Design an enzyme around this catalytic site. Structure first.
Site, short mmCIF file in Angstrom:
data_model
loop_
_atom_site.label_atom_id
_atom_site.label_comp_id
_atom_site.label_asym_id
_atom_site.label_seq_id
_atom_site.Cartn_x
_atom_site.Cartn_y
_atom_site.Cartn_z
CG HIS A 41 -0.62 0.27 2.49
ND1 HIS A 41 -0.66 -0.73 3.44
CD2 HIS A 41 -0.24 1.42 3.09
CE1 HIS A 41 -0.25 -0.18 4.57
NE2 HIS A 41 -0.01 1.12 4.41
N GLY A 143 2.65 6.38 9.61
CA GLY A 143 4.08 6.38 9.34
C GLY A 143 4.75 5.11 9.84
CB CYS A 145 2.58 1.03 7.29
SG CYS A 145 0.96 1.52 7.91
C1 LIG Z 1 -7.16 -0.48 5.51
C2 LIG Z 1 -6.00 0.45 5.52
C3 LIG Z 1 -5.20 0.84 4.48
C4 LIG Z 1 -4.12 1.67 4.87
C5 LIG Z 1 -4.10 1.91 6.21
N1 LIG Z 1 -3.12 2.62 6.89
C6 LIG Z 1 -3.03 2.53 8.27
O1 LIG Z 1 -3.81 1.84 8.92
N2 LIG Z 1 -2.04 3.27 8.85
C7 LIG Z 1 -1.84 3.37 10.24
C8 LIG Z 1 -2.28 4.48 10.95
C9 LIG Z 1 -2.23 4.47 12.33
C10 LIG Z 1 -1.73 3.34 12.96
N3 LIG Z 1 -1.27 2.27 12.30
C11 LIG Z 1 -1.34 2.29 10.96
S1 LIG Z 1 -5.43 1.13 7.00
#
Ligand SMILES: Cc1ccc(NC(=O)Nc2cccnc2)s1
Ligand SMILES: Cc1ccc(NC(=O)Nc2cccnc2)s1
Lengths: 304, 304
Positions: A41, A143, A145
């Site tokens: 992603h 940030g 990920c």
């Molecule tokens: C279904 C998704 C696609 C992209 C996503 N990005 C995250 O979840 N990022 C994130 C933010 C806060 C904490 N951990 C991770 S969720």
């Protein structure tokens, strides 16, 4: 003595963390040999995430569109490919800090250390457990990920998790290092609800053994139980069923303390039925399930 | 989101851990520049510890009697000296992995990361707090002495603790990197009882703010209190008195959440008077006091 939620030393994994930027999205990557691993992603915008077609989005990306930065030096990307939900970016330089490593797919109940990273810079390390509903309760911000979960066996790092997403319920979902998600989660901003978060019974028992070894024995009672009787109470309390395999795995702890596994089950059964009565076990007012039997033996013997 | 007991990445400190052997006793040392720091009780037998005269015991030791080993290579000791309860062993080689560092003496209530070591090999990392009675609740076995506590500010390591001893009550005592013990403890196997382990009130409040930020707000009530009223209840519950300095330190958390510090104190006051009623806050059934206000801001903003 003393019992702490202890993570593996993170140095071996710090030397592998890089920053991967694709367009306006910057996340973390894992640099092992001449390959950088990161969540696929990285190629999406906040909009694309609603319903991304990763193969189509990927066709518009070239090697030069993935910017890999280790510390303050830029790595040259000579190839890119998608393996399930992770991107493997082939760089021209092998990581000089590559430790001995393995990619492993852990089971629910297994624990691991997480090196939380932001912009390829590690910022914290904590110990986690893969929940029975295949989620993890981490501490991840935007940030984070590409931050990874690992275990260390003397000098070999077994990487088991890469952080991908936060569900609406605040819990976390991610993959093994082959791109496969743990559980039924998908990398798409859609209604994904986690299942029942059950307690890892064998881990609770191991932590009850650690408490006995460290002096906290108030919960030791005069009763015993059977696997079937204990499991009746366990089901009622959303505890995972205990199998003969779990009893066997507890054998060395049963041996060290002289407390049979089934007697410890009866102690746990009364703790479930009656509560802590305002008391604490190892400084905790609830039953801890994020230590495996292997973690308890390791901490209580000092495995380096 | 999510809130974990997070330790600093340990890599910078792993590169400083060495094994120090004096006679039959082997413990850990900290190698920074051309000096190895270690607990002075490395020169004692189990017997000497009853009433050691370190200056007299030290007269019988020469440079060649201290065996310093980094990984698998032996370091040459060209000088030795005692500074309070630590030995400084001057080696002929400066540690090539010496990070930027400071020796700091922390206050009770301050938190730090511990890299638990055995035979100069790091085996685990966890987050700790210096208790108000100057003890620490660590996880240390025999062989762990010389394991250090530290904080990291971007790339500078502030070392604040070195493990020296376990008291009869299972708690731990140690020194800053200048050899001075935290608290009234002495490196002698004698009746040393710790004082009242009080709860670090300002840390509890910071963790209540972290809970609000992460979605757990059930404990937020419709009440307020004063510093004097809250402190009356705090004293009764063996909580440290809250000062205007603590209120000021909480300011940024008060600002981020829109909850005034005194309102959060009234919430805490009801939690003390009525208990959790079987509920959990951030997955904890007790009030956590091992996160400073600075730790909460760091984790909630991703300070790398
Ligand atoms: C279904 C998704 C696609 C992209 C996503 N990005 C995250 O979840 N990022 C994130 C933010 C806060 C904490 N951990 C991770 S969720
Ligand atoms: C008064 C003392 C002199 C030397 C002492 N040595 C220890 O306490 N070692 C130790 C063992 C287990 C855990 N942590 C530390 S105690």
């Amino acid at each position: 003595s003393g019992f702490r939620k202890m993570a593996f030393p993170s140095g071996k994994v710090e030397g592998c963390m890089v920053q991967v930027t694709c367009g306006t999205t910057t996340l973390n990557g894992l640099w092992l040999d001449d390959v950088v691993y990161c969540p696929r992603h990285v190629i999406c915008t906040s909009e694309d995430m609603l319903n991304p077609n990763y193969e189509d989005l990927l066709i518009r990306k070239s090697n030069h569109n993935f910017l890999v930065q280790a510390g303050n030096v830029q790595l040259r990307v000579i190839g890119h490919s998608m393996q399930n939900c992770v991107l493997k970016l082939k760089v021209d330089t092998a990581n000089p800090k590559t430790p001995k490593y393995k990619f492993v797919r852990i089971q629910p109940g297994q624990t691991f250390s997480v090196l939380a990273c932001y912009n390829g810079s590690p910022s914290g390390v904590y110990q986690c457990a893969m929940r029975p509903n295949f989620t993890i309760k981490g501490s991840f911000l935007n940030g984070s990920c590409g931050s990874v979960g690992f275990n260390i066996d003397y000098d070999c790092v077994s990487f088991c998790y890469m952080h991908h997403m936060e569900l609406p319920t605040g819990v976390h979902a991610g993959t093994d290092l082959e791109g496969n998600f743990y559980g039924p989660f998908v990398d798409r901003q859609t209604a994904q609800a986690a299942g029942t978060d059950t307690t890892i019974t064998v881990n609770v028992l191991a932590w009850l053994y650690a408490a006995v070894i460290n002096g906290d024995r108030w919960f030791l009672n005069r009763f015993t139980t059977t696997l079937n009787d204990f499991n009746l109470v366990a089901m009622k309390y959303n505890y995972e069923p205990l199998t003969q395999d779990h009893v066997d795995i507890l054998g060395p702890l049963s041996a060290q303390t002289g407390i049979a596994v089934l007697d410890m089950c009866a102690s746990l059964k009364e703790l479930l039925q009656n509560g802590m009565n305002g008391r604490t076990i190892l400084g905790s007012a609830l039953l801890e399930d994020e230590f495996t039997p292997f973690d308890v033996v390791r901490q209580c013997s000092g495995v380096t």
